[PDB]
Amino acid sequence: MTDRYSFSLTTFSPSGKLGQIDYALTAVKQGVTSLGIKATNGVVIATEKKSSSPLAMSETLSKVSLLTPDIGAVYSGMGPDYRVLVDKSRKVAHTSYKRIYGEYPPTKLLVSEVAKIMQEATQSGGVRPFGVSLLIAGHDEFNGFSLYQVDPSGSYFPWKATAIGKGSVAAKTFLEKRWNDELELEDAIHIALLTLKESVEGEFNGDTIELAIIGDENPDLLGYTGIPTDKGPRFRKLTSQEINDRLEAL
Amino acid sequence: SDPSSINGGIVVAMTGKDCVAIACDLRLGSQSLGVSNKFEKIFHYGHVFLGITGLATDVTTLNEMFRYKTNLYKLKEERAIEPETFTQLVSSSLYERRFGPYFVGPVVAGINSKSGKPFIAGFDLIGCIDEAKDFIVSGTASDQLFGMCESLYEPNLEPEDLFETISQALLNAADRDALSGWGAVVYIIKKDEVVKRYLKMRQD
Amino acid sequence: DRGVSTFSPEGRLFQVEYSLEAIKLGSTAIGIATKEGVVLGVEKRATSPLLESDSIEKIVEIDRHIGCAMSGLTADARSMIEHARTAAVTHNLYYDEDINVESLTQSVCDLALRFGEGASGEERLMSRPFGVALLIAGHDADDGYQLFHAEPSGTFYRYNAKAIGSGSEGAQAELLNEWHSSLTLKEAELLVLKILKQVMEEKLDENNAQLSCITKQDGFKIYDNEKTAELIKELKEKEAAE
Amino acid sequence: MDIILGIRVQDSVILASSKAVTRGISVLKDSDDKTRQLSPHTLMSFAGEAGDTVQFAEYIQANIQLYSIREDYELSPQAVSSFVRQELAKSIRSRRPYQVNVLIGGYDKKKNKPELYQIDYLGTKVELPYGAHGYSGFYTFSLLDHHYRPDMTTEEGLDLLKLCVQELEKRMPMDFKGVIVKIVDKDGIRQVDDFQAQ
Amino acid sequence: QFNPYGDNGGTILGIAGEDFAVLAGDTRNITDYSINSRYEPKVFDCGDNIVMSANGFAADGDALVKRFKNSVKWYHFDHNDKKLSINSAARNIQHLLYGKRFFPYYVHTIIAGLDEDGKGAVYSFDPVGSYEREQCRAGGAAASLIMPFLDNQVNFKNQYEPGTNGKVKKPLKYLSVEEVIKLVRDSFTSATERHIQVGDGLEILIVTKDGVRKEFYELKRD
Amino acid sequence: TTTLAFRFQGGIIVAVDSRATAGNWVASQTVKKVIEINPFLLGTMAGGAADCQFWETWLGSQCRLHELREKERISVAAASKILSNLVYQYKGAGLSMGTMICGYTRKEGPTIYYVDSDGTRLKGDIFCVGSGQTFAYGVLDSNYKWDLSVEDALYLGKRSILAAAHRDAYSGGSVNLYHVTEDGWIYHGNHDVGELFWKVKEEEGSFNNVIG
Amino acid sequence: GYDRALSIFSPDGHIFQVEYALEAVKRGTCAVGVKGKNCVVLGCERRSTLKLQDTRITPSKVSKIDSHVVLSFSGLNADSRILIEKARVEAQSHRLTLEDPVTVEYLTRYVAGVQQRYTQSGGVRPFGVSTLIAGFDPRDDEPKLYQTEPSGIYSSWSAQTIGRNSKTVREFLEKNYDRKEPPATVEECVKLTVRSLLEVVQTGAKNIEITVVKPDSDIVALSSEEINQYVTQIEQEKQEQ
Amino acid sequence: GSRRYDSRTTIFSPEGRLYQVEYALESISHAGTAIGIMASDGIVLAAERKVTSTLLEQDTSTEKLYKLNDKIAVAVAGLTADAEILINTARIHAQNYLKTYNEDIPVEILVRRLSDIKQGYTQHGGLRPFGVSFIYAGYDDRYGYQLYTSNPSGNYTGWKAISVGANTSAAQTLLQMDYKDDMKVDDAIELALKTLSKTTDSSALTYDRLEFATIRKGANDGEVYQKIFKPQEIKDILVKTGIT
Amino acid sequence: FRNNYDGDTVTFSPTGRLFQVEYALEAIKQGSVTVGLRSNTHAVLVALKRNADELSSYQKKIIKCDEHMGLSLAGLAPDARVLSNYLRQQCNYSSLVFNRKLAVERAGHLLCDKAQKNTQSYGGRPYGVGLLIIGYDKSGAHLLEFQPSGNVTELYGTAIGARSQGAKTYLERTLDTFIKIDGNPDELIKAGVEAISQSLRDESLTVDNLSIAIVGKDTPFTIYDGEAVAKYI
DSSP, X not given: OOOOOOSBSOOBOTTSOBHHHHXXXXXXXXXXXXXXXXXXXXXXXXXXXXXXXXXXXXGGSXXXXXXXXXXXXXXXXXXXXXXXXXXXXXXXXXXXXXXXXSSOOOHHHHHHHHHHHHHHTTTSBTOOOOOEEEEEEEXXXXXEEEEEEEOTTSOEEEBSEEEESTTHHHHHHHHXXXXXXXXXXXXXXXXXXXXXXXXXXXXXXXXXXXXXXEOSOOGGGSSOOSOTTOOOOSEEEOOHHHHHHHHTTO | OOGGGXXXXXXXXXXXXTEEEEEEEOOEEETTEEEESOOOOEEEXXXXXXEEEEOHHHHHHHHHHHHHHHHHHHHHHSSOOOHHHHHHHHHHHHHTTTTSOOOEEEEEEEEOTTTOOEEEEEEOTTOOEEOOSSXXXXXXXXXXXXXXXXXXXXXXXXXXXXXXXXXXXXXXXXXXXXXXXXXXXXXXXXXXXXXXXXXXXXXX | OOOTTOBOTTSOXXXXXXXXXXXXXXXXXXXXXXXXXXXXXXXXXXXXXXBOGXXXXXXXXXXXXXXXXXXXXXXXXXXXXXXXXXHHHHHHHHHSSOOOHHHHHHHHHHHXXXXXXXXXXXXXXXXXXXXXXXXXXXXXXXXEEEEEEEOTTSOEEEBSEEEESTTHHHHHHHHHHHXXXXXXXXXXXXXXXXXXXXXXXXXXXXXXXXXXXXETTTEEEEOOHHHHHHHHHHHHHHHTTO | OOOEEEEEOSSEEEEEEEOOEEETTEEEESOOOOEEEEETTEEEEEXXXXXXXXXXXXXXXXXXXXXXXXXXXXXXXXXXXXHHHHHHHHHTTSSSOOOEEEEEEEEETTTTEEEEEEEOTTOOEEEOSEEEETTTHHHHHHHHHHHOOTTOOHHHHHHHHHHHHHHHHHHXXXXXXXXXXXXXXXXXXXXXXXXXXX | OOOOOOOOOOEEEEEEOSSOEXXXXXXXXXXXXXXXXXXXXXXXXXXXXXXXXXXXXXXXXXXHHHHHHHHHHHHHHHTTTOOOOHHHHHHHHXXXXXXXXXXXXXXXXXXXXXXXXXXXXXXXXXXXXXXXXXXXXXXXXXXXXXXHHHHHXXXXXXXXXXXXXXXXXXXXXXXXXXHHHHHHHHHHHHHHHHOTTOOSEEEEEEEETTEEEEEEEEOOOO | OOEEEEEETTEEEEEEOOOEEETTEEEESOOOOEEEEETTEEEEOOBOHHHHHHXXXXXXXXXXXXXXXXXXXXXXXXXXXXXXXXXXXXXXXXXXXXXXEEEEETTTEEEEEEEETTXXXXXXXXXXXXXXXXXXXXXXXXXXXXXXXXXXXXXXXXXXXXXXXXXXXXXXXXXXEEEEXXXXXXEEEXXXXXXXXXXXXXXXXXXXXXXX | XXXXXXXXXXXXXXXXXXXXXXXXXXXXXXXXXXXXXXXXXXXXXXXXXXXXXXXXXXXXXXXXXXXXXXXXXXXXXXXXXXXXHHXXXXXXXXXHHHSSOOOHHHHHHHHHHHHHXXXXXXXXXXXXXXXXXXXXXXTOOSOEEEEEOTTSOEEEBSEEXXXXXXXXXXXXXXXXXXXXXXXXXXXXXXXXXXXHHHHHHOSOGGGEEEEEEETTTEEEEOOHHHHHHHHHHHHHHXXXX | OOGGGOOOTTOBOTTSOBHHHHHHHHHHTTXXXXXXXXXXXXXXXXXXXXXXXXXXXXTTOOSSEEESSSSEEEEEEEOHHHHXXXXXXXXXXXXXXXXXXXXXXXXXXXXXXXXXXXXXXXXXXXXXXXXXXXXXXXXXTTTEEEEEEEOTTSOEEEBSEEEESTTHHHHHHHHHHHOOTTOOHHHHHHHHHHHHHHHOSSSSOOGGGEEEEEEEXXXXXXXXXXXXXXXXHHHHHHHHTTOO | OGGGTOSOTTOOOTTSOOHHHHHHHHHHHTSOOEEEEEOSSEEEEEEEOOBSXXXXXXXXXXXXXXXXXXXXXXXXXXXXXXXXXXXXXXXXXXXXXXXXXXXXXXXXXXXXXXXXXXXXSSSOOOOOEEEEEEEEETTEEEEEEEOTXXXXXXXXXXXXXXXXHHHHHHHHHHHHXXXXXXXXXXXXXXXXXXXXXXXXXXXXXXXXXXXXXXXXTTEEEEEEEGGGGGGGO
């Protein structure tokens, strides 16, 4: 027994390529499309709920997840790898930040922590890189709204809007045409729905689409009253119904 | 025996109208022997102020520790740490040594650079936060300081007036404590500027 | 690849056999035991005339009653010497006496097979077998003057005379005919000098060869160059006498 | 305890340390040098627990000499004193603490000013015009408080110390057998071999 | 609270002759004011002509003797059946005792045999390994009663030549095995009279170039 | 116990008594308190019998290892520091030893180092260690000169130990003498205090207070 | 956790990783050392694959291990740092326990031991470095010069060189260095050193650094000029014929 | 066993070269170019952002210039994520030094430490090296303005001007051509931009594709200042130097 | 085939074989011959000692484990030292903790289990030596045969090493005879020497070439070499 794989499984090839990272990126390319758009007063991230069978309950599988009350994430690639990354991300937000400063981490720093976790699966002994790309959206007092992308290599970059996965090339092009620095959240939601429609083959509705936003504080989602400074989470997942109402004005 | 009474020393902080004050004596002794009359007990990281009473060696170690942590914080966050945040950092740093504690009485003072709101806080040696709006006191003459502050203090004092109040509280408390005194320094803090003054006091 | 503790289809440990091949490329070392002591001689074999020959140490003291000569990857012998010296000194601390030559040898040989990447038997942390062979010579009250050949295989043999290194097959054949139960220390010295001369590529002189002996009376001593030079001269004379 | 005194004058730091080593009922030695040169312009005197004293001093010396070779540079007195403070501060919270008090006198060649640091076994550091460890301070700090001046010459400093030593030889219970005095300045460290009657 | 030590009484005696040595010990084992056994051997033949006794806390005495006998066995295994000389056993025993310097074997130990020149030898140890070779040594409960006697009758201390005005010390003529056995038996009958922990039986082990012999004598049982 | 060692023109004198005790009980009058580390190094013992014997014997093994490794005799400074550093590792555990490491090397000349279980290591010309140290110091301090004849030095040393054997209840037995020169130490015999005392009294006229 | 055996025996009795470590040394800049009657000199050549360096701060090829001993090398620069640091630490530890600085042979034996250990320990590769260690034993005036290689083997030399073209410069030294009469002067010693280097450096005033080591911790490095002056006087010895 | 899948990242080739180091360097050669130029009154760091899009938020982006100290900074060429790992340990080493000696860490000591970390991955552990090359720009009171470079092998060297990443050959030649010892920071700024401008594999050199920083001892003060230029500031300096 | 499955002990060949173990077994066959046989009162070991040169000694082949147990080796000597040492300790443990002499049968089980661990894990290698264990315990005389594969068997007599097949056939023939040689050590030995000489070929057993060991009813395990074996040549 005992893990005796203490050497790297990702190494440099004569051409300078890191094979395992390139291959992980290829797995990301085969994944269902997901995207994110940053507005002036919010951020939207969305993807398609590619149910693997009509007998499956697509709601019991969340592709969009809350990391902190003001930060959410979505991905493209290997769903199981994403799931554990979310568990680790939620935990590191506490162990490396909340239990020290008594407040949730700003978006860039949490992204930085996730990125570190992914980089390590690129050099540590006995493991393969995570086969996913993430789109993390959030808000924090001193930086406002932000959107980031994290790749299998651990690299991450901020975006105004972007797409990853299957038809990311076409979707990125469609976003470059409609994006401007004056967009309001509802506008971005609208643009998000339009972009996603080109990537979807079959049914396109609130039950096959998963979408969340980072907007204003939702005092009704807090759970208690009595403390003025505590106004609620900015992260909110739209309901199947909220999505349909917007599809009619498509 | 009592690590908190070996070196002596006091610190006090007060809030005023769009300002804050933090003051301390300058003595550093070894039991009855006065050793140094230049041992300042107030430090600052960016615009956040920290005063520390208790065992001198821990006062020094803690200052170096917080300089170290606030420096990294700034490099990663790309902004100076705020009073409220730093208070939580002190608290968690102290509780981390719950069973082998630093023998100190930290005090935080400053103004949130974004809300302009004056802030102060105190802690016991293992991190419990005392977030009073009026004043925080610490040191070998803490009973005296509580007495002066409760009597002399009043809300919304102007910088120039708060200075007279914090000073009289410090001075008269120090003079009823054998291990406190030997000089004093007062810091008047405003959103834009900070003035440091050395007070004239009894040298016995 | 292939484990460092793998067996060949013939029942031999690859690394140990390949280790023996490295020892064959080393400088020659010869040892001869008599009832008057044991002689140890080596071929310095400097690689350039600018190399100060006396800094070549291939004959070392283990204790007053034990000395030894090496052949092969000589750097590998340091930790072995260190272990031997410690074993001897430690034995004396624990028992107020000299360690027997055979015991000292068995202890050095215990290190030999302690190699591998995780062999189940203890904690053999050493990546490869030693690439050097040793001739351990000494004297103890129970078995008198002795000569042992310690190999990286962990086995050691006692010899009346033995040669190791590049010219061993030739030198050993010579020792087979020259040795006899009544040689004197002087005869042994000349005999070692003679055989070294036959197998060395260079012309043997007091600078490229070195002698040593161990006697019950004075212990282990390394002959200084002047003393050996005379033995060289005395040898040339007896050979030219017929 | 042993006598450890230090004084910073205009262009130098003078260190005075008692020569006796007493164990129980006997004075075993009367020419003990309680000091170690850390670098050409930095000297450290020490007093405290029997074995810990020298072990600590020599340990610090080794580390500074190592830093000097690695960097081919000499750390400033303030840097050295901070290194020494951290070591003592680590020690106070370990299994068995070094019970050693020290005085560090150095001449900072970059600032061209002498400096005197007093650090006790807890890691308590302070920079002073003059200092002392143990009972010595109880008789010398009031003397120096009275006769000290910032612009004193190395010679005036030596007369000031002589005054301190005389007071110690008059009022202290123990016979510390005189002191060894060393001067630290821009030219290094030298020992005043003539203090037995200066 | 738990006390890891106890005291089992007993007394042992070792005397070295010119070409022999003896190690004796009473056979009574006790606890406080009770007798645990009237016959519990305390002196042992450990092989290689060495006799040993570790007196004091019996449990510790047994562990030590057991460990030494095993040491002798391994000495044979690791050094081609070489005989363990008495001086070598002594040093070995020092390391055994000092190994527990911080949780000592609460015993006073004596070993006897012949040195490498055939002479009688006796070695006595401190509970932590301090040792010395001697002519004779009493250990245990009555050691304070016996040693003075042995200093006088074995080494002739304070004894002078009659008529020499205490100017000439009585010569050190050496004792025979028969004369030594007499001193041993007398030492023990005296010890049995004055010390409540001594009695029941006396067992003597004699070591000569021919091996180890044993003699037994009854002692008062009160 | 009383042990002493001093430096002088002819080298070094080393003298020790030979009594071992356990409370008021005299355990032995024939103990060796000087161990011949090696042909050129001497070690004295005071305090715990076992502690001194075990570690000083161990010191010899470490000194021998040095000579095999460095092909040179170990210095008195390096030898004394080996024992000193070892003893320092055990500080607080309860070891008990007061010792003198004495030797003569070409490089250092006659040298004496005092080493105890507190971790103290001191180089010096004169040292007396043990329960009887003060008594030896008394006689030794009032008759010492750097210019004593090997003969007069050996006597002072012997006389000093005698003084201590007489007044210290825990010192006695016999005196063991040693002289240290570059070519090594020279044993100068065992002198039973029983006879030595009377001899010295008569020949010297001292100890006038005892009746004999 | 990583403990793969990287240095092992091959069928012919060689240890390729050690052998290839030597190849890395052959590729390193040349280094030479010659001992005079009262000194030792160490010379090194400076590459020119890229020139626009800041000589003040760029790590020099000769390092002081202690005030009386220096070490130069040929091979991987990064690897040499590891050995230099360990040697420096060992030098201070030795002064601390023996109360005497290390002899040159002792320091050499230590560095060589470290190198050997890295040839038979799991999970590590050998140092791709060979060194020249020179200086004077405490209170001694007899010069010392030793060389160590990847295998861990070491020995002393009257003069020696390692690195690229060391074959060439060694020849120059074998037929230009007389043991009967070693360079009885710091000057004629530095001259023999510069000469041997010119045989391979191909005109490089700024491509040749020298360090002189004398008894009692007297170590100093020459400046471009001081060296440039030696080059000049030597190119004349040639033309004057 | 596992030995079957072990690539052996730390062995020599028959030529005495370290495979993984050579391959990591090959990787570095495809990363955006980074330039460092040291002047009499300051230092300049300039780097080209590899790959960009209209939607890339440049204001909140940093992929090549990082602050290590208040007096030391680095320009990165290679795997960004590998760089962040090393940057963070360097930031720690600097704070440890300040805590120990109460003095800012000398530039070389911090550079040597980071280089030693890199060297380690080269000799033991069986892990791949970091695919990173750094250009360090810093100031200390012993050598003043300094410029260093370190690569995957753990080797480091000092320079007056240097480049890492893509097209260093062409860039080094240009720098060696117009660099002059008596230069001034503003001259350096211009030299840096011109050089990048001629070596870019892109159409034109625009502000959205650059990161700029300087370390000057602003005369009106007496201390050292690090200025990591903002988008607008780069756009400006781009027009002034005549590249519009 | 073989080449692909003989890299380590943790690999089974397509026919269920463990080649590394089989190769270790081969080192035994290359070892010098040794014989073992017992009656109801004694057990005997006879071994042919091999030498390197005519200037070297003949390497010992018999090792004592306790007063009632011992063994002879064939193959890698160092492995025999490791295994005999483990057995010495096990015999030791039994005496110290239970004041009991270790049963030969139990010793065989302990040896089997120790060897097995080295045939199922990565990194290790099988022991490359064969052992013949004899002893006299509470159930009489015993002879065991140990193989590196971990297989231990109790026999009346046997032989291992080169040409061991000769002696083995002779013993399998002499069975009914030697098994009854009770109360007569010299006879059992001669019976063994006759068995071993059935595997000779090169030379003839000499005085510094033969090695004998015996254990029995009132006979502690003792080894006879040289002059002491003269009366049997």
